[PDB]
Amino acid sequence: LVHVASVEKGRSYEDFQKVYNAIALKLREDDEYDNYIGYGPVLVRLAWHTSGTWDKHDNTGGSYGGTYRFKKEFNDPSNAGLQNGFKFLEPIHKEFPWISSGDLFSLGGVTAVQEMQGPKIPWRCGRVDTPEDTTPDNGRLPDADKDADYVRTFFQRLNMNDREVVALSGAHTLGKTHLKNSGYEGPWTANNNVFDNSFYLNLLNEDWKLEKNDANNEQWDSKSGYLQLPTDYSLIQDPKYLSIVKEYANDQDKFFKDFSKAFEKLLENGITFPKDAPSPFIFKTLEEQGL
């Protein structure tokens, strides 16, 4: 199918900045969540998992339909823990009922990245809710117990190349793994609610040991109290990925620019934007607005 972006009736930049602001203000207010990490990271993961179901071969899945609101996707084992992000957005959707679910899920990720001092991420509106029968089956999101070849092949389905894969993986700069959700435990960085290139710095500079966690799964651990999933660690095991990891670890600006492009692309895969559609929006942070 073809999914044409359709702007919420009569809405413009100012309307979406208000939604952005409400999300940002709630992010600031509910600071206790997850031992004070805040909802920033889970909102980014929600935006990615709701977009990552896309299949370039038949345009199924994707962020367009906002299908995560349906139980089949909502209960995907791969999405364990995202219910926290969805619950956070519920009051936002109630105040702005006119925004589509897909626009809200994706905007939530953009808002979180920017408020956490990450790069600006241009965002376009127009996603339209689709029926429950359009919900993609579980199993389209990646496994974490795999190697570089699996990662490379997996992301080709989302039309992402090596650079895009390494940049997107850098989102692990945020949050942590929760044993009860995924069978992995531990954070990737110390400042896990501040978006930066520390994921790459830690991967390259920490001393890693392949250990088994309490769920009997292998994960790389550092004495500093950080982890790297087998799929994260594969980024330094593969020579092509390694060069890019080193590049981002040594150029914060380059990582920001590349992540921004890759993240917008991820959130827009499968969507056809009319030639007369509005230009992408670049929202101001609460800080830039003095709010």
The reply on whether position 127 binds ligand HEM by CB under 6 A is no
The reply on whether position 121 binds ligand HEM by CB under 6 A is no
Binding mask 76-95 for ligand HEM (x = CB under 6 A): -----x--------------
- SS3 string, 224-264, reads CCCEECHHHHHHHHCHHHHHHHHHHHCCHHHHHHHHHHHHH
- CA torsion 186-192-195-201 (nearest 10°) is -60
The reply on whether position 48 binds ligand HEM by CB under 6 A is yes
Two structure tokens written together for 210: 């392949």
Report the nearest approach of ligand HEM to the CB of residue 143 (Å).
6
Q: State the Cα–Cα distance between residues 152 and 131, nearest whole angstrom.
A: 32
User: Which helix (H) or strand (E) segment is 17 a member of?
Assistant: helix 13-29
Q: Which does 111 bind (CB under 5 to 8 A by kind): K ion, ligand HEM, none?
A: none
Report the nearest approach of ligand HEM to the CB of residue 8 (Å).
25
Beta bridge partners of 219: 211
* Catalytic status, residue 188: yes
- CA torsion 59-64-70-74 (nearest 10°) is 80
Within 185-204, which residues bind K ion (CB under 5 A)? 189, 191, 194, 196, 198
The reply on whether position 244 binds ligand HEM by CB under 6 A is no
* Catalytic status, residue 54: no
Q: Which of 101, 173, 217, 231 binds K ion (CB under 5 A)?
A: 173
Sequence-ordered alpha helix ranges (H) in 52-116: 71-74, 83-95, 101-115
Annotated catalytic residues are 49, 188
Binding site as annotated, residues for heme b: 172
**Contact residues: ligand HEM, CB under 6 A:** 41-42, 44-45, 48, 81, 142, 144, 151, 168-169, 171-172, 174-178, 181-182, 184, 229, 231, 263
